[PDB]
């Protein structure tokens, strides 16, 4: 229930990460401004699909694939994690 | 366009200005040499590299003669062989018969090239020359009867290290190399003259007489004494570290290592933690067993949870240990994970790697046009980065400007005051250096992470980000060139930030913990005065300096020479240290200690082997398993936007680096403090002579 | 002539113990040039060697003891592909390090005496 | 040796010795090198 | 120049001496410890210094082909003697 | 006079070259290469399945009566796809000559047994199998010849450790000699001897 | 790529040879226990034969299987002919080797081995 951190893994050149890249470029600052104390770590993948890790309390982690998503899909999926639904 | 030359009749296309030596290298033939080093200038005085051109009556110096169109280079001709034999005859005519008492011994270029290219007999029936031995400090031992006057040390000293205290005095056969006065050649890049001297005239004094080159086993690992991440080779012998040598990596190390990296390996044999220690009824530390120590620690971990659990990561910790401790502390929902070094967390913070990385890599300095250093002393924080800066300065007329304290770098730079008010002036546009940066085609701004330790580090970071923003707006937006840069001085800082540790110990100061895990934390940032009474301290480390004296439980770990581990340098590159020797006594690997503690406590971690721990590392941050890659994504726009919204006031204090002198360079970390050679160097540079 | 759609694997025939088949990570690499010498003749063949194991001190005479059969085992290969094929067919884990060659450098003796550039040398 | 006495040095044994195996004067080997690693000595004073 | 450790054990010219709590001393019980009485460092210190009136001298250890490789020592520094390092032999120029 | 240099025999070099051309012409199906070393040794590289025809020709042909099998060994070269190189040394008493025939094979590919041409091939091929793992198809009795009973592994391979994996001692509890994992009081000290300066330019390989 | 088969062509003939070798070994254990005067049971010997057969159950190359059965026939003929001694037969059983720990915690306690 208690979210502790969010991690977004997106490859910087693969076509499948194009939607996640657009979210970082034009939507990350607004998201971070709303959650100043939430660790939102953006990292880099080489040849695998993009991932969304959500570390909850007591070390529970859920990974959501972001492969071939759009910027709107990434925003909705991320706010679902923040909302809890 | 390329011109066609011939080596032994084989065609090869070389750029104009290429030398005969480099053309032969391209076709795969290594011409004998003594005074030629590719990292230094061309001298051409040993005359060992003479080769014959097909029609030329006279042999040419291969190391200095540019190739012309349609030249045939006869490398193994009769004239070439006779020239090599004559030169070797002269050299060995004046050399002394010191091979068995010479540290160079089996790794001597004079011996090898004499055995390959010279004669097997001597015609010298006269007396030899004996030269008085000079003294240039505690690190380099000079036996100058073995010098062959190749002037490599002179060229290296001046060009590379910026120190002009080496030269030749006198002339003729009585020509000598030295300082002409009782002066010590003390510099952060001194042992490289030990490496480049082709003979035994300059030899390592700590390594004197200990071993021979054929005995030693070479282990290719990396360096942990600083955040450059130099590639090194560890020479071991019968399970004992004998020597540290440079390993070529032209984007990081470039064949050189600093004196601390080279000569502090003997701190790994002193003040070592070899057995687990607990406290008896008297409060005195006594040896115990692994089972007992881990049982006590796990009992405390089961008792307490939440923000009453903290961990402080030191400067010599590895990614596997960091991630294992992070997972173990997350098993109890605790999060007081911190590193003993401060980085501004306001705005983007550690969220984007292109906010604390050195975005323009070390090799990218050679392409920069203007570089501005803010609140740092690269000569001691990162000797190889400063050597690269000096090389770029020399070979490209790079303009360097330093804001703050006027430390004596090895090159001429433009000094800008001492205060961050100048930093605000540059961003505004009042300073002339603003116009210099605007007109520069390739600017670079490097802010030292030692400046961020101040109470106003966030303001300094915001100011320099604004300067980079102004540079980007005025100059070309397009391009892969990156302006903003951060220079780190701690080996584990970047790996910890990538994993998700909170920089600085401010969180632990805010919420004092009941249980504190000092993972190699010898900095003394947090002590029992700050901690609550009866706080349980577990120090896990390899040297007993501060945390071990003040800790309740002591767990011995392994050093970098003793564990296979992962370290991330200041430019974001990841490199794996390999095992050279094994931990002494009952010492174990750090992630193994953490995993065993978790298993005893009941919150068993999901990894049992090194590959599984590295798979967890790939889960948390894949850049930690992509090793030699350095390319990454640039998020300066987002970082600057997040930094703008909150701003504070710069303090009215001058930017003074922590290290102002070479003694402050010599003593920085735990292994250096435990080293006796570093103590000798400090004594030499303080008391002189 | 039969056809097999299988990867070659001779671990069951080599006679190596299962411990030294499974828990060993060899390192395929080109040796770094010894900085003490300018020769480059030892940086031409790939090498395969095993990870270091424990060495302790003999109680009598103080010699260095070992229990790892593969401590002195180093193999020479002409190519990275050959080395990797050998490692795969013998079943050991392997880490491959790409060969490092020095980049070409522009050298000029005349730069020592530049009229206005910083490359001018103060000594010879 | 009476006709040609050997060269006399101050380090040469004055008294010759036979094989001392099976006697308390026998040779016992040992390592003639010092300790390689020095271990940390914890403070003898209390703390906290 | 043999020296005795606090445990009653002789100290070798390399400084070897078993610690008080070292269990390896059991091998010497009812037997003896092999220590050479003559110390080469002491004897070579007992050797005198040869004064020669030349800037460079040559040492082969004595005996010619039965000595060590011939080396040349430069006697220019007046604050110390020149030492042949094969045989540890000191030479000096006539001062005063 | 050049007293320190071996004199050369161009007549024997020419004779060996001519005979190599002769055999290569006679057996084009199997012979892949013919070489003459500068110290006058003829070397024939064949396809591995031509062992029986080539050896029978070299034994029975009137112009090549190589009636004696001087030696039979193998060389392990891991860098090759077919690591094992089987070498046959033949001696012709009629023409006072010697020849060498080399084939190749790997771990899982058998080589036809030449016990039907020479009888020394029996023990020579048993030793090759014992020390390298190379299997010979139609061998009358193929088994270990030199290694201990029940010994696992083929010692002469390059990837086999020098001291092996097991060692023997007598155990008083069980009243018999036992085999235990190898453990050395002093580890073999490996020396890196190769000089980093190229010795023989005549053998230099292209940089590729 | 067509490769020269040692025996057995496909995998089924290799399995047939494996079964023949297993029968030969199964019918030899009583005679081996009798001749060598082994103190082990016949059931123990058959269990050891079964275990030594099962450690190669992951092989999928018919040539590797053929080589394995060739070596099995060799070491069977070393036993029928009493070329081996009781020493080797009991070397199959590792009666003197101390049991190495297998769990992470015990391996951590003993030493540095992975
Ligand atoms: S520098 Fe080389 S040639 Fe000279 S004494 Fe030393 S090992 Fe011998
Ligand atoms: S001391 Fe060494 S590096 Fe310097 S000139 Fe002499 S031989 Fe060359
Ligand atoms: S290497 Fe060219 S003259 Fe010295
Ligand atoms: Mg040197
Ligand atoms: Zn002497």
TrEMBL record, chain A:
It comes from the Eukaryota. It is a peripheral membrane protein. It holds the Pfam family L51_S25_CI-B8. Transmembrane segments: none annotated. Residues 12-85 form the Ribosomal protein/NADH dehydrogenase domain. SUPFAM superfamilies: Thioredoxin-like (SSF52833). Disulfide bonds join 11-45, 11-45. The keyword Transport applies. The keyword Electron transport applies. Complex I is composed of 45 different subunits. Accessory subunit of the mitochondrial membrane respiratory chain NADH dehydrogenase (Complex I), that is believed not to be involved in catalysis. Complex I functions in the transfer of electrons from NADH to the respiratory chain. The immediate electron acceptor for the enzyme is believed to be ubiquinone. PANTHER family: NADH DEHYDROGENASE [UBIQUINONE] 1 ALPHA SUBCOMPLEX SUBUNIT 2, NADH-UBIQUINONE OXIDOREDUCTASE B8 SUBUNIT. This is NADH dehydrogenase [ubiquinone] 1 alpha subcomplex subunit 2. The lineage of its organism: Eukaryota, Metazoa, Chordata, Craniata, Vertebrata.
UniProtKB/TrEMBL annotation, chain C:
It is a peripheral membrane protein. GO terms for biological process: brain development; electron transport chain; mitochondrial respiratory chain complex I assembly; reactive oxygen species metabolic process; response to cAMP. GO terms for cellular component: mitochondrial inner membrane; respiratory chain complex I. Its main location: mitochondrion. The keyword Mitochondrion applies. Residues 99-124 are annotated as: Disordered. The keyword Mitochondrion applies. One of its GO terms (molecular function) is NADH dehydrogenase (ubiquinone) activity. Keywords: Electron transport, Membrane, Mitochondrion, Mitochondrion inner membrane, Respiratory chain, Transit peptide, Transport. It is found in: Mitochondrion inner membrane. Accessory subunit of the mitochondrial membrane respiratory chain NADH dehydrogenase (Complex I), that is believed not to be involved in catalysis. Complex I functions in the transfer of electrons from NADH to the respiratory chain. The immediate electron acceptor for the enzyme is believed to be ubiquinone. Belongs to the complex I NDUFS4 subunit family. This is a component of the iron-sulfur (IP) fragment of the enzyme. This is NADH dehydrogenase [ubiquinone] iron-sulfur protein 4, mitochondrial. It comes from Sus scrofa (Pig).
UniProtKB/TrEMBL annotation, chain D:
Coiled coil: none annotated. It comes from the Eukaryota. It is found in: Mitochondrion inner membrane. Belongs to the complex I NDUFA12 subunit family. Complex I is composed of 45 different subunits. Accessory subunit of the mitochondrial membrane respiratory chain NADH dehydrogenase (Complex I), that is believed not to be involved in catalysis. Complex I functions in the transfer of electrons from NADH to the respiratory chain. The immediate electron acceptor for the enzyme is believed to be ubiquinone. This is NADH dehydrogenase [ubiquinone] 1 alpha subcomplex subunit 12. It comes from Sus scrofa. The lineage of its organism: Eukaryota, Metazoa, Chordata, Craniata, Vertebrata. The gene is NDUFA12. The chain holds residues 98 to 145 of 145 of the full protein.
TrEMBL record, chain F:
The keyword Translocase applies. Keywords: NAD, Translocase, Transport, Ubiquinone. Its main location: mitochondrion. GO terms for biological process: mitochondrial electron transport, NADH to ubiquinone; mitochondrial respiratory chain complex I assembly; reactive oxygen species metabolic process. Belongs to the complex I 30 kDa subunit family. The chain holds residues 43 to 250 of 264 of the full protein. It catalyses: a ubiquinone + NADH + 5 H(+)(in) = a ubiquinol + NAD(+) + 4 H(+)(out). Core subunit of respiratory chain NADH dehydrogenase (Complex I) which is composed of 45 different subunits. Interacts with NDUFAF3. Interacts with RAB5IF. Found in subcomplexes containing subunits NDUFS2, MT-ND1 and NDUFA13. It is found in: Mitochondrion. Core subunit of the mitochondrial membrane respiratory chain NADH dehydrogenase (Complex I) which catalyzes electron transfer from NADH through the respiratory chain, using ubiquinone as an electron acceptor. Essential for the catalytic activity and assembly of complex I. GO terms for cellular component: mitochondrial inner membrane; nuclear body; respiratory chain complex I. GO terms for molecular function: NADH dehydrogenase (ubiquinone) activity; NADH dehydrogenase activity. This is NADH dehydrogenase [ubiquinone] iron-sulfur protein 3, mitochondrial. Residues 46-165 form the NADH:ubiquinone oxidoreductase 30kDa subunit domain.
